[PDB]
Amino acid sequence: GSLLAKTGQAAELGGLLKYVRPFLNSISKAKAARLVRSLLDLFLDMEAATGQEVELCLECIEWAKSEKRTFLRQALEARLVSLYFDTKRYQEALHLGSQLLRELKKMDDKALLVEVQLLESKTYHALSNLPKARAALTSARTTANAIYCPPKLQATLD
Amino acid sequence: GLPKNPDLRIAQLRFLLSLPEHRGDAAVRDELMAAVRDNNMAPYYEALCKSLDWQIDVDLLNKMKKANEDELKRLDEELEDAEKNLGESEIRDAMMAKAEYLCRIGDKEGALTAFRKTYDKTVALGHRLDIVFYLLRIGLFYMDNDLITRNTEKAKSLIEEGGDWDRRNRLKVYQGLYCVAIRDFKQAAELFLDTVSTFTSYELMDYKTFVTYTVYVSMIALERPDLREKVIKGAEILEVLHSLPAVRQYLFSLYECRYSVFFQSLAVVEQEMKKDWLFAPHYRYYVREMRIHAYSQLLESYRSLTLGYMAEAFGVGVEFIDQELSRFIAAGRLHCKIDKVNEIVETNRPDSKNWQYQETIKKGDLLLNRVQKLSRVINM
Amino acid sequence: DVLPPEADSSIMMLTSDQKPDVMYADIGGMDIQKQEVREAVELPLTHFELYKQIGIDPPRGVLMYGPPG
Amino acid sequence: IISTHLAKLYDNLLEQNLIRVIEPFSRVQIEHISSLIKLSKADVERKLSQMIL
Amino acid sequence: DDEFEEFPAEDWAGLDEDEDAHVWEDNWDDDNVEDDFSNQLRAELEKHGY
Numbered sequence: 083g084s085l086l087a088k089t090g091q092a093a094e095l096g097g098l099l100k101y102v103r104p105f106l107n108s109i110s111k112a113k114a115a116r117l118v119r120s121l122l123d124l125f126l127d128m129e130a131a132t133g134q135e136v137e138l139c140l141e142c143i144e145w146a147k148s149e150k151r152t153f154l155r156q157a158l159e160a161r162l163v164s165l166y167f168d169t170k171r172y173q174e175a176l177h178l179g180s181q182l183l184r185e186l187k188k189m190d191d192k193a194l195l196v197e198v199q200l201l202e203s204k205t206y207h208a209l210s211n212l213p214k215a216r217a218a219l220t221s222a223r224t225t226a227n228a229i230y231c232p233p234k235l236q237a238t239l240d
Numbered sequence: 241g242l243p244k245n246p247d248l249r250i251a252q253l254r255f256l257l258s259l260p261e262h263r264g265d266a267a268v269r270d271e272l273m274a275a276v277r278d279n280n281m282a283p284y285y286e287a288l289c290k291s292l293d294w295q296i297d298v299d300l301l302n303k304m305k306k307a308n309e310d311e312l313k314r315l316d317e318e319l320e321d322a323e324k325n326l327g328e329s330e331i332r333d334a335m336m337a338k339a340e341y342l343c344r345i346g347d348k349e350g351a352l353t354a355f356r357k358t359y360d361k362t363v364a365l366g367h368r369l370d371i372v373f374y375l376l377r378i379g380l381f382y383m384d385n386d387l388i389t390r391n392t393e394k395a396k397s398l399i400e401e402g403g404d405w406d407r408r409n410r411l412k413v414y415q416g417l418y419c420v421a422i423r424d425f426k427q428a429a430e431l432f433l434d435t436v437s438t439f440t441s442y443e444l445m446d447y448k449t450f451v452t453y454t455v456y457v458s459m460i461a462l463e464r465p466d467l468r469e470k471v472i473k474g475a476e477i478l479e480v481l482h483s484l485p486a487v488r489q490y491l492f493s494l495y496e497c498r499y500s501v502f503f504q505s506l507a508v509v510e511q512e513m514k515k516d517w518l519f520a521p522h523y524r525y526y527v528r529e530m531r532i533h534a535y536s537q538l539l540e541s542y543r544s545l546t547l548g549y550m551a552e553a554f555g556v557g558v559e560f561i562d563q564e565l566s567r568f569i570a571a572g573r574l575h576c577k578i579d580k581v582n583e584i585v586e587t588n589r590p591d592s593k594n595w596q597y598q599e600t601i602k603k604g605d606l607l608l609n610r611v612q613k614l615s616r617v618i619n620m
Numbered sequence: 621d622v623l624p625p626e627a628d629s630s631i632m633m634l635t636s637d638q639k640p641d642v643m644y645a646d647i648g649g650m651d652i653q654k655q656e657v658r659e660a661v662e663l664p665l666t667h668f669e670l671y672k673q674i675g676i677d678p679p680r681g682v683l684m685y686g687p688p689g
Numbered sequence: 690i691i692s693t694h695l696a697k698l699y700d701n702l703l704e705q706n707l708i709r710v711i712e713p714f715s716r717v718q719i720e721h722i723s724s725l726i727k728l729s730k731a732d733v734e735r736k737l738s739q740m741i742l
Numbered sequence: 743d744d745e746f747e748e749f750p751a752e753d754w755a756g757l758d759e760d761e762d763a764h765v766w767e768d769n770w771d772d773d774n775v776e777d778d779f780s781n782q783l784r785a786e787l788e789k790h791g792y
């Protein structure tokens with residue numbers, strides 16, 4: 083995956099991701115999930131196949147749901163909220179963020195909640211929704227008090 | 241409150257098939273697609289005018305209507321005969337089911353009868369609110385402006401006084417009376433900017449349609465004061481204009497006072513309002529009033545703007561703009577005069593003192609008429 | 621005559637309204653709780669109509685028995 | 690917050706230049722105003738309008 | 743109480759329809775007849791060439 087990212091390959095990386103699934107369902111859930119996240123991010127980095135990225139990640143989310151890896155599928159849902167904001171998606175990003183918030187507040191994840199709230203504030207600002215953006219950002223601060231030194235995340239919040 | 245909303249849709253489809261004959265091919269298709277469904281035989285005495293007397297579903301559809309209505313009637317007979325449930329009991333919701341059958345299936349007459357019956361029977365807060373809402377919805381369905389006025393009067397007078405946080409669920413259609421009528425200038429807006437919907441997408445066919453009504457009403461309402469801080473500042477407003485680009489297009493065109501795109505967008509707006517049953521200002525306040533406001537805004541802060549250049553700054557056809565200005569000056573607004581021998585627009589804007597003086601003398605005329613009438617009242 | 625003003629009769633502060641001194645989220649204390657305080661502002665934040673209908677009885681007196689912290 | 694703020698600042702400079710050059714004149718010709726501001730006529734007229742409306 | 747029928751009481755013999763059956767307030771201009779404005783603007787665009 084590192085060499086594929088260095089060269090800029092897309093089809094080979096997609097095939098490798100679609101192939102490594104048995105190895106994913108054979109090891110620690112957290113390690114496999116983070117490997118999946120890293121591979122997906124590296125694939126989405128360079129080659130901008132906007133007609134394929136969303137569909138591939140949605141297939142990955144459906145696969146994670148079938149594997150009952152709830153935190154994995156939630157992480158990819160947050161990643162697609164980020165990709166939706168990158169692609170200037172109007173309200174589908176919004177309802178995906180709302181669904182993520184509903185699924186996550188019942189849990190006690192914190193990094194995902196901060197990222198989701200920050201993305202919601204970002205998309206409110208993109209749609210020029212200033213008061214809801216302010217409310218979401220205040221909630222983002224209230225949630226982000228938890229992580230003490232997330233050096234990237236604190237810069238994002240600021 | 242979901243019922244009578246698809247009924248509103250079929251009513252608007254009948255409007256689009258009947259009043260504009262330009263829509264006579266796709267209008268037939270949508271009318272058929274929403275009338276072969278929804279059990280439209282009793283609500284087909286209105287549909288027979290445009291299409292055939294009855295579409296070819298007669299046997300099956302009438303059997304379905306009669307069977308469903310007979311089943312609900314049997315249920316109502318059981319509740320009202322075998323059981324003596326009175327007042328605060330389940331007979332109230334039984335008669336609500338009766339009215340729902342008579343409305344969503346049968347014609348409006350039986351629905352209105354069942355409504356008035358249970359309204360006179362039970363006067364509880366929740367029941368009364370629900371039935372007032374249903375009466376308003378069926379009135380705005382069948383375009384009985386008399387029924388709409390009646391239910392609006394009773395609700396705004398006493399029904400809404402008892403019980404709160406439901407007026408926020410009702411004003412959006414309680415102001416539909418002003419919406420469907422000509423009064424889209426002040427009252428409709430003042431009570432209609434409230435972005436608190438009783439349902440996410442219902443009543444007025446959508447939240448997007450709700451917003452389009454808001455935009456039309458505000459555009460009729462004012463021109464460009466701190467409207468930036470009244471509606472433009474609205475975050476939900478900006479979001480829904482992002483959802484609707486052309487709507488955002490003409491709204492921002494009016495706000496920016498760019499007439500070149502404004503007139504084309506305004507013609508598009510008038511065309512859209514034609515495809516809408518809320519077309520009461522067919523010749524007064526589609527485009528003529530909005531451009532009266534726009535021309536006032538333009539020629540104010542101006543003294544002598546040339547016709548030939550204001551024409552290209554406001555579209556094309558110098559003769560078209562000249563005749564429009566003449567017609568509107570004859571109408572009364574556009575406080576200015578036209579120097580035809582030199583083709584100039586010499587405005588006459590009164591000072592604050594002068595215009596307000598004129599307003600006071602007008603009101604003095606009206607009140608002298610009033611006091612003369614009252615002097616007639618006395619000494620007789 | 622009856623004197624209309626009442627606050628300056630004995631001073632004791634006055635209308636600290638219409639003035640942003642410290643807005644809200646700018647506070648450094650985050651919450652402590654602050655949820656019972658948003659609860660206390662619910663009544664100023666309209667919601668007196670929603671106190672009824674729902675059947676709740678909104679709080680009236682809020683004592684904070686804390687040190688200058 | 691790049692194009693929007695740059696446009697806002699540009700409007701600020703336009704308004705400040707016009708207000709700074711406008712005090713002496715009880716009535717001034719707008720092409721002279723445009724000459725002082727070093728711009729065309731239509732844009733200067735549009736800005737002065739949007740200010741005064 | 744009398745209706746003053748001595749003055750010629752020619753009641754309106756239509757009894758067919760109220761043209762403004764609703765609360766709409768008309769204006770002297772509102773009742774002019776034209777092809778609204780959309781068609782007129784289309785004709786203007788055509789005569790100017792676009």
Ligand SMILES: Nc1ncnc2c1ncn2[C@@H]1O[C@H](COP(=O)(O)OP(=O)(O)O)[C@@H](O)[C@H]1O
Binds near residue numbers: 646687
């Ligand atoms: N962001 C902040 N968060 C918490 N306390 C603050 C903040 N900013 C200022 N303060 C301090 O809070 C203090 C209020 O203290 P004080 O009113 O005397 O306590 P008490 O209300 O118990 O008498 C002020 O003196 C001020 O210095």
